[PDB]
Amino acid sequence: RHDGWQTLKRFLPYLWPADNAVLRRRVVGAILMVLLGKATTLALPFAYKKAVDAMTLGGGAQPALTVALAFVLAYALGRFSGVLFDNLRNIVFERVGQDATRHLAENVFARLHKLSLRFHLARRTGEVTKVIERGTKSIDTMLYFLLFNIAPTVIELTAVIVIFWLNFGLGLVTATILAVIAYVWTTRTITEWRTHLREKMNRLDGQALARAVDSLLNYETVKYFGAESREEARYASAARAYADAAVKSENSLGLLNIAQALIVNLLMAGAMAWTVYGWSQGKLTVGDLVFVNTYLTQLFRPLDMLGMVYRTIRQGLIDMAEMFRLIDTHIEVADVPNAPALVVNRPSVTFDNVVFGYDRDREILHGLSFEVAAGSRVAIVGPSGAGKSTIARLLFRFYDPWEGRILIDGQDIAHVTQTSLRAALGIVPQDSVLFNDTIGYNIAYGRDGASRAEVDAAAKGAAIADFIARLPQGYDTEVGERGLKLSGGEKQRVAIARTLVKNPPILLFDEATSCLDTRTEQDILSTMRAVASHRTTISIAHRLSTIADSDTILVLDQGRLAEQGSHLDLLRRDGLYAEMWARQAA
Amino acid sequence: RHDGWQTLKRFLPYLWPADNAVLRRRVVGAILMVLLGKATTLALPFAYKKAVDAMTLGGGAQPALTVALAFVLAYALGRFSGVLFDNLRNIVFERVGQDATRHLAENVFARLHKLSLRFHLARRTGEVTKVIERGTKSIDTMLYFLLFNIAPTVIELTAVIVIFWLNFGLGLVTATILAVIAYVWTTRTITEWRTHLREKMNRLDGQALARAVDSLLNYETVKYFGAESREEARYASAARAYADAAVKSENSLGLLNIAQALIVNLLMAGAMAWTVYGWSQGKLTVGDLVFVNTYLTQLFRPLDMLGMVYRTIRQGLIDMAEMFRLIDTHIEVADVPNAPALVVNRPSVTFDNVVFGYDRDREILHGLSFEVAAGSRVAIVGPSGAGKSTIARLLFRFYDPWEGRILIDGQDIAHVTQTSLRAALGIVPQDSVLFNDTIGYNIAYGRDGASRAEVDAAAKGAAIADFIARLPQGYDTEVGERGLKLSGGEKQRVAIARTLVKNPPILLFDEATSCLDTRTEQDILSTMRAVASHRTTISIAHRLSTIADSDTILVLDQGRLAEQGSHLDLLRRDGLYAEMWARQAA
Ligand SMILES: Nc1ncnc2c1ncn2[C@@H]1O[C@H](COP(=O)(O)OP(=O)(O)O)[C@@H](O)[C@H]1O
Ligand SMILES: Nc1ncnc2c1ncn2[C@@H]1O[C@H](COP(=O)(O)OP(=O)(O)O)[C@@H](O)[C@H]1O
Ligand SMILES: [Mg+2]
Ligand SMILES: [Mg+2]
Numbered sequence A, B: 001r002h003d004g005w006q007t008l009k010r011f012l013p014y015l016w017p018a019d020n021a022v023l024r025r026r027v028v029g030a031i032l033m034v035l036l037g038k039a040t041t042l043a044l045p046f047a048y049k050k051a052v053d054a055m056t057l058g059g060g061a062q063p064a065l066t067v068a069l070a071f072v073l074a075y076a077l078g079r080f081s082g083v084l085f086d087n088l089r090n091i092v093f094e095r096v097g098q099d100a101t102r103h104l105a106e107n108v109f110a111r112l113h114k115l116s117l118r119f120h121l122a123r124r125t126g127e128v129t130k131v132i133e134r135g136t137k138s139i140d141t142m143l144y145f146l147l148f149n150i151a152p153t154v155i156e157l158t159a160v161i162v163i164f165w166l167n168f169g170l171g172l173v174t175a176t177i178l179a180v181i182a183y184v185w186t187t188r189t190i191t192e193w194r195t196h197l198r199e200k201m202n203r204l205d206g207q208a209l210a211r212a213v214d215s216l217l218n219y220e221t222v223k224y225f226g227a228e229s230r231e232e233a234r235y236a237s238a239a240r241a242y243a244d245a246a247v248k249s250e251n252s253l254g255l256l257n258i259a260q261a262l263i264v265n266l267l268m269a270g271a272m273a274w275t276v277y278g279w280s281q282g283k284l285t286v287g288d289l290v291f292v293n294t295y296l297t298q299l300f301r302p303l304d305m306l307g308m309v310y311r312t313i314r315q316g317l318i319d320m321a322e323m324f325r326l327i328d329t330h331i332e333v334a335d336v337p338n339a340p341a342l343v344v345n346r347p348s349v350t351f352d353n354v355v356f357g358y359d360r361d362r363e364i365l366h367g368l369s370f371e372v373a374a375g376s377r378v379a380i381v382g383p384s385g386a387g388k389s390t391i392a393r394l395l396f397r398f399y400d401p402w403e404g405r406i407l408i409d410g411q412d413i414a415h416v417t418q419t420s421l422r423a424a425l426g427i428v429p430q431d432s433v434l435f436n437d438t439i440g441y442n443i444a445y446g447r448d449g450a451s452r453a454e455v456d457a458a459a460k461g462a463a464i465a466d467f468i469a470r471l472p473q474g475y476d477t478e479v480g481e482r483g484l485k486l487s488g489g490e491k492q493r494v495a496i497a498r499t500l501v502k503n504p505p506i507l508l509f510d511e512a513t514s515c516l517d518t519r520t521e522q523d524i525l526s527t528m529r530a531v532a533s534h535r536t537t538i539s540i541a542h543r544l545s546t547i548a549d550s551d552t553i554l555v556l557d558q559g560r561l562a563e564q565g566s567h568l569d570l571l572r573r574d575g576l577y578a579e580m581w582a583r584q585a586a
Helices: A005-015 A021-056 A065-113 A125-166 A172-217 A219-225 A228-280 A286-300 A302-327 A388-395 A418-423 A439-444 A452-461 A465-469 A488-502 A518-531 A567-572 A576-585 B002-015 B023-056 B064-113 B125-167 B170-217 B219-225 B228-280 B287-300 B302-327 B388-395 B418-423 B439-444 B452-461 B465-469 B488-502 B518-531 B567-573 B576-584
Strands: A349-356 A365-372 A377-381 A403-408 A425-428 A506-510 A536-540 A552-557 A560-565 B349-356 B365-372 B377-381 B405-408 B425-428 B506-510 B536-540 B552-557 B560-565
Touching (some): A005 A065, A005 A302, A021 A125, A021 A286, A021 B228, A021 B287, A065 A125, A065 B170, A065 B228, A125 A172, A125 A286, A125 A302, A125 B170, A172 A219, A172 A228, A172 A302, A172 B125, A228 A286, A228 B023, A228 B064, A286 A302, A349 A388, A365 A403, A365 A560, A388 A506, A388 A536, A418 A425, A425 A488, A439 A488, A452 A518, A552 A567, A552 A576, A560 A567, A560 A576, A576 B518, B002 B064, B002 B302, B023 B125, B023 B287, B064 B125, B125 B170, B125 B287, B125 B302, B170 B228, B170 B287, B219 B228, B228 B302, B287 B302, B365 B388, B365 B560, B377 B388, B388 B506, B388 B536, B418 B425, B425 B488, B439 B452, B439 B488, B452 B488, B452 B518, B552 B567, B552 B576, B560 B567, B567 B576
Parallel strands (some): A377 A536, A377 A552, A425 A506, A506 A536, B377 B536, B377 B552, B425 B506
Antiparallel strands (some): A349 A365, A349 A403, A552 A560, B349 B365, B349 B405
């Protein structure tokens, strides 16, 4: 049983790359700068003590000031050299720190892309925004505070213990040890209490800000129902709660600082009083008193932030463990063990006794079996909740069937590589998304090495090349958010051009026209009929009139195949498809 | 320059609430605690200097050991009392600070709700989240640093100048003043340079995080086209750019700290050398050396944060000026001074020669005039660019016509109060949004004092009460984002129930069923026909079959009224409406 250390040890390869010489040399130089700065900050109070002694004794300077002048100049130069070494170590190590955190983030990103519905379960705007906005900052803060506050403070504490032992290590060493122990214990307990209060304050702040954002984003609704006063009172109550929580949190912070100062000042009083008492017996000089003062101040100056340091290090460790846990996530999606590549020569589709559900307590597909001939035009229709979008998702193997299988060209898609499987399939879903880039990039996204000629051919096949030609920047016009806005038909056409760039043998149109206007619907339906020239096409449409010209139609009811056949045959059977068509006919 | 001064002058009423009591006593107590803490931190180095003097001389009315012990105990007690006074001032002032920031945020929110057009111009995704998350933070840090670091430092600097003059020579004062001036100047220049580099770093960080979020949110699309490697490389390039920018920023911070330490330690060397030189000539005592040391350290330790303080003060002033500008924003559509409340006795609608456009360079409504009789069921149809949603928006007076007007019950809507006008109108738009709360709240949002019984009646009239009854938590079920997800039909039903709770005499259905399924479409169309019992109803639909039963049909083309009449009459006319109906016949 062990954590924390384990986590830091897994992180250490990122800090210690063993692939970049320069970075290891920089880590060594940073440690050397740590040592130099600590040595200088320990040496300068000795210089101050010797200057004071020269002012109170005769020393080795005949005017006695020369030694004092030299030593006060040495004290000032030591302060400057300590700060210089600290900033030099920061400068040298910052590159290694940034590179380590960047590599960790890249690994987490690459693993996230491999997870496949670990997100479909949780894709809340708040969760995504919070995670992606916090991840790097938490680690940066934890790493910096740990490496450049705990280790330097530990080194300084050990060196101060040694020096304090050599020079009256009878009682002051015990006193400083007791003071450090009490300080750390009190800081830790009060910091845990303060972290509880801080979490409550942060929750209230998030609630108030979320209420404000929801109000401003729904301004149209507020005006529609005249709820300005109600929303104002709501936000005012939330802000009052947040203010009370913040007041209590800052009062707890004040108590923490008061206790810290009490401990520190008790140690200072004891040490200085004991030192001057020893001076009265002639044991020690006054420079020893100033020495003790400066040593204690230099020791406890980093510990002033100790509560914040502890809290931030804890949070960073938690978040780093979270990142490693995300990396150590099993991929339920595909087995693909030594899988051979899928070779689609005749693009047929087979559903063999497919039984599937999202959760074990509810069941969707009760043994659905059907055949889609290669090159045929097939439609998939059904009422709400029929599960045809689940058919679309299972064809791409977003899930694996519990009891059944899916075949492409007669080959089970569960036994082939995901790359070859998804390379043979193109899909245009109901809600098509555009990347935040130029139209040229959005169209070329279909294939990696996509050339300009292929992009032009796809824009021509999607009947959108003329629309792009009329744009001022042409293919370099940025679309999506923070860019040029496109109509729903334009988004669907860009998606069609993307899938054409991909050029897959099998195509799925999942309610492509479900939210377009009738003119645009007819235009893009003609475009889709044109694009279905030499491909196997499956059109999952809600409106039956849009797919009446299909080679065959599959009617789904309650997750099973109720009816199959051509439009005229299904109408003549006077069944479920005929009932739906009759309802929609007028 | 002077904008920050005007900003602080505008803020001062919030900090010092002239017309307000008790919080002013809190402010006075906080200032008194500031004064006590500064006095104690100035007094303790005198105790240290006198302790050193007692240790270096052999005289004194009382035993040198007694006086030395008393003075070191006084020094420790002064340190403790200074920290105690600082924490007490923080605790006392936190209430006033939180209340002032809350009142500022409330005023900004209230003024933001009283603006109509500027929302659409500023709807960027990062825009809203960034401003809402950052405004209060910026104000808080700037206020804290100003009131508790700069002003105490100014008091301490004046007191240190006075004490150095009274107890030391004109030259120590001259040197410390020149050093403070050089420190401030260097800090200012380097902090401006650092703010430039830091802004570049933040922009690159935002770009990298936005790329990561866009990749992860479009995971389905990335899998559709097998672009995992491309997305990884894009994120890696963005992260490398961000890492380089961060490295340069932290190197600039190191340079700033190096310059600050150089100035401070040059002043320290000069002052200490001058003090020991004056002591060697008998001008000053040896305790004066430690006195000067402690005074300079206590003065310049808070100035270590001067760069961050300056940057935060600048950002807070900018953001506060921006908030005050938001409060001092002119309303486009403002009420007339003595506007009477709208009295709807006969809910007719009249558009007389309405000419309107969003921008003066483009024009949408080319003098549209029409009459909607009270209690009648009217439909408004047209192509995608006809501009009928602009009719819907102008009915609610989101804008004012350029040349023309709109009447409700014979009264110009531009001459009545906005509240009564919008209270007399209810609207169900195509994309209805839910507030982040329970369904009971989402339905009761129609009216302020909406009861649970009114919610039940509205859910019954919207044919959604049974759907809510089958939910486990019933009306207390949280819906919308970060909650239970509802289908488009369910959201439209909740919106209809909301408008029913409002119970307005005039209803507008703006393409409410354009994205619903057929069974839900028929159910919600029957619901709309039912709820139109004693109300004037205007149904703006693109699909003619959904509004064929309307009393009359208004056909819009190119922003003008092309055809008017009933469904049968317009079909008989064989015009534009007949052409659209024939095209849709399918
Ligand atoms: N992420 C999910 N978690 C749980 N249940 C789901 C999820 N997605 C879909 N379902 C359920 O599975 C069913 C699948 O039907 P669906 O494919 O949506 O039909 P259609 O394609 O006609 O809308 C739906 O009724 C829905 O209730
Ligand atoms: N906020 C806006 N600023 C500028 N132009 C707009 C804005 N909103 C819409 N438009 C343009 O004005 C026209 C208004 O049409 P609209 O009434 O939205 O059509 P519909 O009634 O079919 O929704 C649209 O063609 C659109 O291009
Ligand atoms: Mg679907
Ligand atoms: Mg509209």
